[PDB]
Amino acid sequence: WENTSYILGVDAKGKQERTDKCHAAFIAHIKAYCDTADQDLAAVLQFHERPAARQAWANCLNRQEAAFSYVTALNYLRQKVTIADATVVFWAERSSPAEDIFAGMLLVAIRSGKRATDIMPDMDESVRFHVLGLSPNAARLSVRFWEVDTVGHMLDKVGRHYRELEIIPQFNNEQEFPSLSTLLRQTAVLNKTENISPVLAGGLFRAMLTGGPYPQSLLPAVLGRIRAEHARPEDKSRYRLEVVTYYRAALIKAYLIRNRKLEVPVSLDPARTDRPYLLGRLFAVLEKAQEDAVPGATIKDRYLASASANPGQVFHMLLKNASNHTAKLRKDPERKAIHYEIMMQEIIDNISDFPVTMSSDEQGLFMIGYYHQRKALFTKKNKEN
């Protein structure tokens, strides 16, 4: 048929078309395999499927006809498009629902987080809501995901089951609802050009829209990105040198919630007493003692990967170096300080032995506890006039 275009892809050309030989089934000519009003002996499109719903849209704008209809529908209509690493469309106007469906792109909000369905009227109804995310190869568009639900209970999953998970203390001044683009970008090497395509973009987009579990490679991705990064504030302009940022931590928290177990959502629960959480807090206070004793520019050899997965065989030397750092501290009139070693005794108290290994979910708890005990010690909180 005619060509779909204008998606963020390679050639912006048509989909559902055959140009090769190995897509030949029950031999048909070139586009009779997918016959939608082209050969009028049978039409797939109305004579839970996407191009029939498209055709349902292309006759909502008018107060081979099927091909014409749905390909002028994919040729949108203005604002119903977005991109995570591949295009994502949506459409419903049967009651003028005030389209606000977004992947996301102090205390900046327009709705609740999760307390009830939003108080703006004409937003809670039964009219269906469609969301089609289609990805490019070179000129053929894989339907990476497709969703039909009701905005009556689509908002009830996109935030009212999803941003209730990534809610976590804001480390700095930024947005409360972390946008899916920023969330995915903290899992890539450096930027949103190398977002893992299938098992993060499509995977957890489908999770956000669907309420199903996250991919079982979301947490290993954030883990292996925590290891593969290092503090470097001399290369970035936005102020953040942390390796466990607000987004990596929020995302590990959401994974641990919707896959494993309920965990601390707040700045710090010092009554937690779960060995991974406690070891993360201990690592955090060690690095605090280090960075306070010597300004550290601002460089330190990275043991977070080592201590997260093999706590004993690293925490021995980590605690010895922390003793040295508290010594260098107490040598100066910076000790009445001395409550760093006190915190270390307190945390070691609840720990019978340093565990040999830690599972990936235990590592995620380690990262969450580190993030918590890290924001606990900083001095920036609630700065907005």
């Binding site: 090497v189 299938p198 098992v199 490679s217 292996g224 040999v356």
Partner: protein, 286 residues
């Protein structure tokens, strides 16, 4: 080529060491991962490519075993070679009308192509020849435990294109799996073999190819892959004697009791096979 009179199952255990057994072309080149369980995947066509490669090498083009490899050529050249060998009409593009000529082209393609004879090959062309299914249908191999891949940043001294910032040197990245033990499930239906002449000698070649599948595929990405245990389930009837899923769960691959932590060698894995139905002979000497 007397076809096989028994049908088979097989469970192949192969492990990887500091390598990438299979990359996902959508996840960069990271090892494939089942997003619903976490265990690493290795698609069936991956191991089929490795089987074809082993048969290509170990046979040196010895006829009755030509293996449609990758080379600088096209299928349709040989579709048409068979065509002129049988003197047909070049127009038809589906299954031909007369049965003897289509059967002749299919039987020539199956009598001298081990991969067509074993896995099948689809010969629908402007000059058509038909289809084949072939006995051996393999499936996605999945690790026994969730694998976690490690991004290994590497460096290169030289630069490909002209330099303007020399830094200019680029940083590469090797995705490796520290360890994984992958289990593949296989099925060899005897009647499809009877339709494509898949013989007994072909079956022993298939077993050797499953055993030495990686001894010939070494490279910078794979590291040390190796076939650890190959377990064969042979049914006495040419149809089944016991369900497929019933036999595949006779293979319990657990962690050896002496170990703890993430596995890093096949010594950290104990494999046991239970007793089989009265009409199934389980062969583990491979």
């Amino acid at each position: 080529m007397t076809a096989i009179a028994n049908r088979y199952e097989f469970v192949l255990l192969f492990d990887v060491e500091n390598g990438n057994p299979n990359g996902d072309p959508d996840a960069g080149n990271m090892p494939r991962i089942d997003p619903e369980t976490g265990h690493g995947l290795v698609t069936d066509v991956c191991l089929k490519r490795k089987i074809r490669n082993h048969v290509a090498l170990t046979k040196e083009g010895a006829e009755r075993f030509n293996i449609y490899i990758q080379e600088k050529a096209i299928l349709n050249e040989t579709h048409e070679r068979a065509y002129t060998a049988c003197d047909l009409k070049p127009e038809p593009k589906k299954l031909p009308k007369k049965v003897e000529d289509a059967k002749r082209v299919t039987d020539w393609m199956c009598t001298n192509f081990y991969d067509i004879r074993t896995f099948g090959a689809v010969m629908t062309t402007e000059v058509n020849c038909g289809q084949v299914r072939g006995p051996v249908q393999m499936a996605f191999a999945r690790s026994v435990e969730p694998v976690v891949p490690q991004e290994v940043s590497i460096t290169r001294m030289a630069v490909t294109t002209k330099a303007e910032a020399e830094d200019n040197r680029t940083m590469g990245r090797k995705h490796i799996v520290p360890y994984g033990l992958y289990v593949a499930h296989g099925f060899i239906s005897a009647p499809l073999a009877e339709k494509t002449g898949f013989s007994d000698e072909d079956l022993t070649l298939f077993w050797d190819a499953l055993v030495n599948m990686f001894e010939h595929d070494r490279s910078a990405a794979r590291g040390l892959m190796s076939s650890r245990k190959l377990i064969v389930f042979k049914h006495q009837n040419r149809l089944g004697n016991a369900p497929a899923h019933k036999l595949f769960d006779l293979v319990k691959v657990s962690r050896a009791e002496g170990s703890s932590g993430p596995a890093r060698s096949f010594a950290d894995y104990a494999v046991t096979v239970g007793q089989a139905p009265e009409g199934v002979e389980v062969k583990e000497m491979l």
